[PDB]
Amino acid sequence: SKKVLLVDDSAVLRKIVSFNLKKEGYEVIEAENGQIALEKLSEFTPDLIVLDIMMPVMDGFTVLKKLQEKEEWKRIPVIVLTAKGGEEDESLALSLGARKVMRKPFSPSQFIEEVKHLLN
Template sequence: MSEKTILLIDDDELVLKLLDINFRQKDFNVVDFLGGEGAFEKAKEVLPDLIILDIMMPMIDGWTVLKQLKEDDSTKDIPVLVLTVKGAAEDISKAMEVGACRYVVKPFNPSELVSLVEEILETD
């Protein structure tokens, strides 16, 4: 599955690095973005095949970014996988209602996450 681009949005540099390494090993093009501020604009610039988005970020949180992505014509059809420490049922429901395609709770298994992303992109 080459030539697919993933935009990673998280405020934790270690998570970004871990994800970056794992997806690059599977021949994905990866764009890392630290934090929520400017993330929506970056998504519009990159127009990735998939976005992995953290929810708990300072300044502009993932809820705001997700809502912006799903309300904009140029980004509304990009699948968004939410990756967060918030595992409550109401958070999962909210993410799906706003437009996330999947919800993964941290801590996570990187190889399982890569497999999930491959599955999402194959069915997209």
């Protein structure tokens, strides 16, 4: 089974996304902010990170920056999943090492297809 680290400050969002990921046979590890994410990332290297932008303590842009500065982290694929739209958010996220940027409210089928693109 592939392992996905799901990083979002919304418990409701994490519930929905984890449910959809598990249906595909993936195993999910959760983090409610960027700091928690990096703490868990010190322990293991997931096959994929799904990453929110707007979070307390440490936001998604900061996470992306920190992933790039470590040899162990810089190759992990990241799909940014965020309520925020606009070219600037997309450009910044990609410039900091995100693979894909997707918008909330999330379309489960489109999301899962992209996850599949990167994993299988």
